[PDB]
Amino acid sequence: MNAPDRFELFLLGEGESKLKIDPDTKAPNAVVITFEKEDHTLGNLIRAELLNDRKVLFAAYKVEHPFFARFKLRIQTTEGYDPKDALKNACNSIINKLGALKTNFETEWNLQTL
Amino acid sequence: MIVPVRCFSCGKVVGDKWESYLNLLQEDELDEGTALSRLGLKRYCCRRMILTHVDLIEKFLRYN
Amino acid sequence: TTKIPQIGDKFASRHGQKGTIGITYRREDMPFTAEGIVPDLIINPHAIPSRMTVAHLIECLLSKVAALSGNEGDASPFTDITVEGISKLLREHGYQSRGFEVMYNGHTGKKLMAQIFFGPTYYQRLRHMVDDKIHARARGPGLRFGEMERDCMIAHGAASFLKERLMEASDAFRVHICGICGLMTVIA
Amino acid sequence: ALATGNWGAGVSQVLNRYTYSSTLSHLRRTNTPIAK
Amino acid sequence: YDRKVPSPTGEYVKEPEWVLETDGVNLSEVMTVPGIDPTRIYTNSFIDIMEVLGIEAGRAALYKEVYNVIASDGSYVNYRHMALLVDVMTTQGGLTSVTTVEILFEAGASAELDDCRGVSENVILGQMAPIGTGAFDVMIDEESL
Amino acid sequence: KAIPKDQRATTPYMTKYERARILGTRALQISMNAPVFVDLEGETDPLRIAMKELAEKKIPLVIRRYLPDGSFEDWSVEELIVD
Amino acid sequence: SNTLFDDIFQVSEVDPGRYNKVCRIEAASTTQDQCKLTLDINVELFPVAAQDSLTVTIASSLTRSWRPPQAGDRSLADDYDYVMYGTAYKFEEVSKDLIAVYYSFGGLLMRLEGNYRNLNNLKQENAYLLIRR
Amino acid sequence: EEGPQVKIREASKDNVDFILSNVDLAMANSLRRVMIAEIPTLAIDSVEVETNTTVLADEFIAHRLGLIPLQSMDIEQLEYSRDCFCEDHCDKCSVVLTLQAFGESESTTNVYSKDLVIVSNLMGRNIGHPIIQDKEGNGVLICKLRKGQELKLTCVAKKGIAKEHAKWGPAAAIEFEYDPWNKLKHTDYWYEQDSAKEWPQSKNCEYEDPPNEGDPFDYKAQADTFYMNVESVGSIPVDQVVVRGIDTLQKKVASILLALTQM
Amino acid sequence: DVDPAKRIRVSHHATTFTHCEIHPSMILGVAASIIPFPDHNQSPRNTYQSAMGKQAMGVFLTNYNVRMDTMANILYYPQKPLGTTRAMEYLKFRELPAGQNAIVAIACYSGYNQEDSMIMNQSSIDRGLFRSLFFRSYMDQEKKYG
Amino acid sequence: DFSARTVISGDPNLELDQVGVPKSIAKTLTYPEVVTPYNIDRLTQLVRNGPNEHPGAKYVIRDSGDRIDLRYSKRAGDIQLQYGWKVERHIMDNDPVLFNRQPSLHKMSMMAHRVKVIPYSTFRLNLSVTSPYNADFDGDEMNLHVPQSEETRAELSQLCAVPLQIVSPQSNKPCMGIVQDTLCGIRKLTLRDTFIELDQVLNMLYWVPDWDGVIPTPAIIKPKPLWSGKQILSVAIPNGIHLQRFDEGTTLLSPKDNGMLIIDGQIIFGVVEKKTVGSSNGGLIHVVTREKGPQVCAKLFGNIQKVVNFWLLHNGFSTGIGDTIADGPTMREITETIAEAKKKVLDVTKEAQANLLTAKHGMTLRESFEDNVVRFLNEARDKAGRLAEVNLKDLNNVKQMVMAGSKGSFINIAQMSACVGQQSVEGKRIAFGFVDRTLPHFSKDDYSPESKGFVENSYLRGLTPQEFFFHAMGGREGLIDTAVKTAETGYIQRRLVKALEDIMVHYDNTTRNSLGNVIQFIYGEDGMDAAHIEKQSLDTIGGSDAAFEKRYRVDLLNTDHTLDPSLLESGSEILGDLKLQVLLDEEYKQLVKDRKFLREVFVDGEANWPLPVNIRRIIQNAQQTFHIDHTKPSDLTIKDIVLGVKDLQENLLVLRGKNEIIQNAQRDAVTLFCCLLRSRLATRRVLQEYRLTKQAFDWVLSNIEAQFLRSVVHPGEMVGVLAAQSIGEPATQMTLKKVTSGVPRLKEILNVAKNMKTPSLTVY
């Protein structure tokens, strides 16, 4: 047939990267990062954290077509604050709060019968 | 043709429930809905699975 | 061969309206109900009010009850079955009675402002699918360009296209021609 | 004549077997050759 | 019927009028009946319109029959397209309906001159048709620097 | 039978059809390695080249418009207004 | 940099018609026999009742992005409850020998009848609108 | 332990109902999506048919095999076949199972998934075993034979994610709700005469204070508390759908940090 | 005191009946006896279903494995319809069905189901929804009249 | 030959002018591209990939005419291309190709699209090209054709391309608009009460592809930053777009949120529904096409779709059996509405039964009876249906679809929820096909509603058996009528096309056949292209004589009737000036004649007629563009206006010949446009209503002139075929009084039939 293998949704082709980072021309201190073999799972999550950061002026993501697992996230920040830093700062929160949660959970689950 | 292995929609295994469902009707005399709820098939997706299966293989097995 | 459903294959309820699958979505990306039930199929509301296919909607209500309750639902014509009666029974089982449910957007988890008519309905897979129907003849050694197509191209004024498309590849032979008696009598 | 539909012609056709009720339907069809 | 007509102060008003409508047609004679307005008589038979009032008045009836058809379904087509049709139907002076070897023999004997503007004739000759993009020639501009 | 440059009575504007046929005759020649008259400020696509040509008014071609009775007027690409 | 009309209004009427989040106050001035307000308000973010009363100021600042709060965690050119930002589309209904200026707050609409500030109310957009209770 | 808070309310070998409390909607939905889509698991994914005189076709059978859930507690210690340096499969990337059946009896012989024999070396990682949850310990019905009929097969299982095909999904339905009263006005309720008479109250409302009619809407409130319930099919116990769920996200995010570093 | 939701029936103003119908749903033929609620549908639609049903895939006979016909389509997992008609019993449609009860939502959700199109669940397809077998048979004769 | 055919599907993520072509189809069709230094690297790479990896290539042909086959060729990985060889490459992104849904009955059923290579197996399209193609996604297929040379590619992109067909000649309005979901939702998005919060806003903004990066300022700042639905859509409407419209009592404070007003590409007021964003004479797509050009108009469909369908994906919309149930009280009213019509019927019955009814004039008794009972029974249906419509709430999803314009109408509400109504066969009630009865369940001579086909029930309630059978009688008659219409229409369509096919416009502006005969001395009587014509109102025509003389008369010798000096800087100085007043008398005399002329043209008084050059929208632009204060006298002078408007008329040229004859033709061609013109730019309007400056006014003119000139039809156009396809195409959507009508009439016309079915004289 014409159906792209399903592995293509999670696994990089020859020459593809996890990220491509590009400068946005429209406004200052802005970037657009395209994430390959990812989808809303990550894209809505990174995005939503970038907005809990008050040095974050803009953030937003989209999957431009549903047939490809790739998203595009646009971050704008205050002058002096690199956007790629805002994405370490935000990926770092995430991983921390989940950290947290797998512990609060692993716990609640021994306090348990059946 | 056979009980499908899972609910098409939610994935719950349901292919280990057919002999029991049919035992629960003919042997212990429950109505079809009480029976399905006894096997724990409580969303209408899984219930539709067993309730509307047709075991056609039982016909196919009569040929030689 | 086994045929697994694909973009392009046709399907229909039993109320006289078909569709082809325009895309598939894995379950995570589908909208879902607080019980985590998710649709196997999603059909557009715009296909409803002009066709006045009310029985589609009543089959889906009656079908929801039937699943919940384990009885076959009586959909014969000319009985006393009513939507009101159907809707009672489905309330007794804890859902809102016109077959709406709150659902949640898959991409985000957030609730949907509107609620969704949701239920089982019987769908048929029809024969005659995207793999039987796709062909693509461009030579090496419908699907035409007839009188009407030509006329469209004339309307647009596309003469070069009309000459390329309707030519021979039967080669352009050359010939001398008297300018008095236009005939191909000239000895060259 | 059974192999053809040669009679009046379309009088004999191959039985449909797409689905069980399309068969029953074919066995129960009628035809009217050629004022309302 | 209501008829929009200017009022004494200048604005358009409704003024009802009785009108008669018939089954059947005899235009040349009913026109002549005392008491009617012979300037505004009509019929949907545009042939009779042409027979009594002439080709132009037939042309205008015919347009108005075609327009009625199109509008009665509720759609709208620009004037010029139905104008073109109706002109083609009335340019020889009457109402003309719009609805191989053998033929070349006749061409021969009649001395048929083919203008070569059609798309098929041009195809057979390996050419573009003088329509649209082919209705002019393009040439190399030796007059330029 | 030819109509002197003055006295020409047809539109001084280029038509969609002339435009299309120009651009396309010229991209055909650009496509077969014919010399170009304009600065390729990057472009590789023959139609696109052609259009930059048309815009810089560097397409040396003439449009011969026949009138229904056989006579004709010659309009240069340079001169035709492009709207 | 300014403010530009400012007054106190009596509420005649609150119509929600057909909507649930938004209503149309009909208000008067306590003061001028002449100056009126017909105005669209988000009633869920800022409720309002018959005869309540309203301190209303058009103003025109304190066109670049918009940046979130922060500047706003001291910088408020607002001591008010309720601030909208719109655009005047005016028609200077210049009617009787009183003015009407129009304004649209992403389509919540206003109208001022009156007269004294014809040399006052911007020809123009950049127009904020401000309410305390 | 500050952060996202947990609160189990029920638990069972099969389900775990809980409440996440102090998190964003996004993280909560994301962990939902991961549990559905990306936790690795083991599943028949190649089947070689020596004999089938069965009244089903082979791919019909094969498909059913890929759906029998197979033990998967030790699946971190199986490598993905595509990552392994073997030619094809081996014991580091694969369990191999066998199936033989013959209708010996007069009466009809069923084939169940307990009739599945592992034939490869497990290195005592608890994987591969057909899961069995019915009183009679038959597990799933795969097929049925008539006296004289035969079926012989081998299968290879392989680690996989439900993205790739749902057979590899550990989760079944995942209940998920928030704001049962509707206080957030995230949804707008359709009704004929009265929205409250006509919509049923969620079970999750008891847990949460009804609102009071005066109360002018709360513009500042956010969605901070989520009523979940994860249901497992059994190839992975439950608590583990969650924890490997949380763990799978956390690794996705880290592959992003790792790839900033590599720029 | 009638049920406001029942349809209006116009009574027996008749003391002369000689007969009575057995059942009014018996005016229908085979195809239209598989539509649920045809009396709630605009009439041409019941006509187009009566054609489409003839194109659906089901199990045309139990013996298919043994016949050899030019073409055949059998669905993997026929289900009987949650909403049936009393006529079906005689048409055996519950025994040899030609469909599946699909969970359906009616919604705009992403725009990929406009203009009589549909979004289907890929996970559900993975697990078997609407999958089917297709068979083709080819024949050939031998020598002849040479 | 170089073409493919498959199943079509919609895609909200494709541009209007794209078509998605599956990869496997793109590997089968090819374009021969010549090697040159501009492409010899890409061609090399494409050769190296070969026939089965897309972007690749199937053959290489050299100097010789030798055909190298890449799939066999033992040297297939070792080709060193030369300048001047050819490579036949797969088609690829952005190649023009032509796409067509059959039957192709008008030219927008065959448009050129930009390829986009995609995975699975359907050709995919934007939703908004569906309606020209008359296509949708339940099995339809369409054909794709690949042009084979450079000239052929240029024709297709510079004349057939989709964005160039937005506005069609057929009806001088767009043929493409926003439909279905995006139209259900753009209204929802645009209601008063819809606000969006910041998280959602920024994702909608990023979703428009050429958002400048500016977050607009929110309509609510105060308790909370909340932006409106209107503002967010507005980010897709480009700058310098103005549009206004009043509906039944719209005002500039639209209490209802009616009408529409949009200024500098921002929505001010009004809900966006089918009249603004549909395919409508004068809405947004028609305005943007003309003010900014076809490309930008074509992006706008994709930017509105992106934004709105995002929004709608998270808002949700559905419909269900509940949306057809009307209130207990409404039902009782519906059932009484119906009870009263049956009592009307019963009296008109009893009446004819006692011989007391009169017929009137040639109409039989029984025909009068029938006519009356059917009016009763229809008028019942309708009231019962109005009842139901009213009772449904704004959240009723059926009603929401109807209000948006995206699907369904009153009759559908009505038949679903209130009552389906009288069935008919050949224009009459169900006839007595058993003897004296319609079915054996009735007794003889029964003319009541039930007996002859009134279906009292709605679809929700269901039909009884008798009604069911009569509704199927009826139905059947539509299915047959429909096949006969389709067949009848198709033959007509082919015969008009054959009759007109050769008529062309020539460079003298005359319309002629292949013989050179003259059919028309100027095309369309005005020399315009019908794509460049819009409905405008001719102001002089209507109105009272008093009102016409307040608006247009300037009397500079009268203190009441001069130009107030606040209008004009010269105002003081022109009071009492005698020679200006001579000009102005001359302008008024011309307005006066204009009005009389036009009242003879349009006897009726109809003021709105299609003309080229939408003057009101040029003025409104000038007013935005020059930031024009309604509070300052203008510096225009009398003579600037008056003689500026006369001069402009001399340059609105359609014919250019130096002789008198051609001059007259020219002046006759441009008369009606010139009346519209003088009425719109008359002195008192320019100063008192428009308030133009000199600079604005000078720009108004030079633009009217450019736009006029660009409306002139182009020689070469094949207006024949066009005419034919414009008349036949809409004669095909006649799928549907006591005069022979619609298609059979239309046969009777084109056939010139001696023996017509209903000949009639109307005599005044």
Ligand SMILES: Nc1nc2c(ncn2[C@H]2O[C@H](COP(=O)(O)OP(=O)(O)OP(=O)(O)O)[C@@H](O)[C@H]2O)c(=O)[nH]1
């Ligand atoms: N705009 C619009 N079109 C409608 C509406 N309701 C139904 N349609 C149609 O119902 C008729 C037949 O049904 P369909 O089979 O769905 O139409 P179709 O898809 O063109 O049929 P195919 O030829 O098989 O492709 C068509 O003529 C369509 O116009 C409505 O409310 N609005």
Ligand SMILES: [Mn+2]
């Ligand atoms: Mn359709």
Ligand SMILES: [Mn+2]
């Ligand atoms: Mn179709």
Ligand SMILES: [Zn+2]
């Ligand atoms: Zn289920």
Ligand SMILES: [Zn+2]
């Ligand atoms: Zn290995």
